[PDB]
Design a binder for this molecule. Sequence first.
Ligand SMILES: OC[C@@H](O)[C@@H](O[C@@H]1O[C@H](CO)[C@H](O)[C@H](O)[C@H]1O)[C@H](O)[C@@H](O)CO
Length: 138
Amino acid sequence: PLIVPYNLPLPGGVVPRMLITILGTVKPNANRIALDFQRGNDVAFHFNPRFNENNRRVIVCNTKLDNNWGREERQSVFPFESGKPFKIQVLVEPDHFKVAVNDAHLLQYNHRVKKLNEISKLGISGDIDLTSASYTMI
Ligand SMILES: OC[C@@H](O)[C@@H](O[C@@H]1O[C@H](CO)[C@H](O)[C@H](O)[C@H]1O)[C@H](O)[C@@H](O)CO
């Protein structure tokens, strides 16, 4: 079991073909989950399931530059379930992060932060029990 919030260093930054896998279980009555791929203080890719935003479940994605959030990209397909185990896979492709949950494609997020090799840590936070956080090359 891993302590949340959890920092996963990404040595040498991300690169196309890098696959990050997060395994955990959503807490009962969860409100949020967040993955934050960081370039220093900037957040290149924030992936933020929200379980009750005005009585809707939505995934909010964004980038934070110089402490300012940009334009949100919202996905209404919501594969997380309170109380249940999940797998998030984030595949770095040349032009986007590609995210699958429980082996099903969920969304893509076009690279706004383009210095991929400088995106050198992943923060994992929110209302989960974190089981595993790892990476490999495919
Ligand atoms: O509610 C405050 C507002 O800035 C938005 O919430 C922020 O959204 C970020 C991503 O865009 C982060 O998730 C941050 O943690 C969160 O506070 C909010 O999403 C509004 O834009 C809704 O209209």
